[PDB]
Amino acid sequence: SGLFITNEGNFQYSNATLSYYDPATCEVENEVFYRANGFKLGDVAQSMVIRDGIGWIVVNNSHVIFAIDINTFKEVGRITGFTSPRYIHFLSDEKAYVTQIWDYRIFIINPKTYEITGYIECPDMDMESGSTEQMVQYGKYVYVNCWSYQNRILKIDTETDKVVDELTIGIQPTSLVMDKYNKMWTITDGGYEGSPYGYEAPSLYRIDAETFTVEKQFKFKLGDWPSEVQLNGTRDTLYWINNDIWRMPVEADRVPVRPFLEFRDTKYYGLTVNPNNGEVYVADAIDYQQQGIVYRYSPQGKLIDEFYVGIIPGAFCWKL
């Protein structure tokens, strides 16, 4: 088994990289895409998904998704022409969605043929400030958060590839997961000081998937800049970043008083939970300039291992 770490590098400097970690040996290999291919990913490696032996790496500011063999790391294909891609969600072997920033459309692709095959137009959205981000599936529907300069979750009918509903919440929901009770969780970042769109106290929401209604809202503090909801494998413990790493049972009616991992005046930036053994990996960007570090914790918050990765490690992908 193994773990991929994407490193965004510094936006507009083309220093994104890919790392691979073997939890059995506690060994990391850095710059593995370069090592295998003899050229680099580009600018802002954002996310990665594995399906059927192929890893799909989204390079947000290089207009491309690379497909690699998960064992040799060699490029086996790519899809180009994306405005500014974010996340990939597969509906079948021949259809996936690829969300975008700076676009009002979600690209449809055929992963088998490496082609763009359609577009989904989002309502009340333009290229100048458009954003679609993470996706969860609920039956024939996909829910998607709209992050940058947006304040919505959209609901897409995957039969017709159409947006069929929307829910307005606090500004800039960052991320989206679905728990075992078919409740979605999203956490907003609250914008930023001087934003043209807004700056506010951010919130964590629990949203019923069936009825698309907010059930819980936990509001934090003005100045907080949270992100990155994540679930354990059984989808009953939620983790997120808000300075510290926090977690709580998805049945909770109150937020925790003690964090999983205390803030240490660095930059916790990426987060995953091993879906089989519950170990928690925290990617620390440190100061957004130096080489980042990943910290690996037991389910009880004891440090098992830590290892240097690339610059601004932001996402993980499990190879199971």
Residue ranges of the annotated binding site for adenosylcob(III)alamin are 8-9, 11, 60, 86, 102, 148, 172, 192, 225
| Other CB atoms within 10 A of residue 72 CB | 10
Q: Does 179 bind Na ion (CB under 5 A)?
A: no
Here the contacts of 149-152 (C-beta below 8 Å, separation 24 or greater) are 149/196, 149/197, 150/125
Q: In terms of CB distance, is 20 or 25 closer to Na ion?
A: 20
Q: Is 174 in the site for Na ion (CB under 5 A)?
A: no
Residue 313 pairs with which residues in a beta bridge? 7
CB of residue 166 vs Na ion: minimum separation in angstroms? 13
Question: Measured between alpha carbons, how far is 62 from 80 in angstroms, rounded to an integer?
Answer: 9
Position among 232, 314, 316, 318 found at the interface with Na ion (CB under 5 A) = 314
Stretch that binds Na ion, among 22-30, 72-80, 81-89, 160-168 (CB under 5 A): 81-89
Instruction: Give residue 60's identity as a one-letter amino acid code.
Output: N
Cβ(271)–Cβ(281) under 8 Å? yes
Q: Is 170 in the site for Na ion (CB under 5 A)?
A: yes
Q: Which one of 114, 225, 307, 308 is in contact with Na ion (CB under 5 A)?
A: 225
Q: Which residues of 277-307 are buried (b: 16+ CB within 10 A; e: fewer)?
A: eebbbbbbbbeeeeebbbbbbeeeeeeebeb
Residue 16 is a binding residue for Na ion (CB under 5 A): yes
Minimum Å gap between C-beta 225 and Na ion is 4
Cβ-closest residue to Na ion?
9
| Residue from the set 43, 161, 179, 279 that interacts with Na ion by CB under 5 A | 43
Contact pick of 132, 158, 186, 243 for Na ion (by CB under 5 A): 132
Between 135 and 261, CB nearer to Na ion:
135
Q: Is the CB of residue 316 less than 8 Å from the CB of residue 292? A: no
Residue at token pair 């060699």: 74
DSSP 300: T
202 binds Na ion (CB under 5 A): yes
CB of 219 to Na ion, least distance (A): 9
Residues 236-295 contacting Na ion, CB under 5 A? none
Closest CB 191 distance from Na ion, rounded Å: 5
Q: Residue 96 Cβ, how far from Na ion at the closest point, in Å?
A: 14
| Eight-class DSSP state of 60 | G
**Which phi-psi region, left, alpha or beta, contains residue 194 (left: φ > 0; alpha: ψ -120 to 50)?**
left
Bridge partners of residue 215, in order along the sequence = none
Binding site for Na ion (CB under 5 A): 9, 15-16, 43, 86, 100-101, 103, 129-133, 147-149, 170-171, 175, 177, 188, 190, 202, 225, 314-315
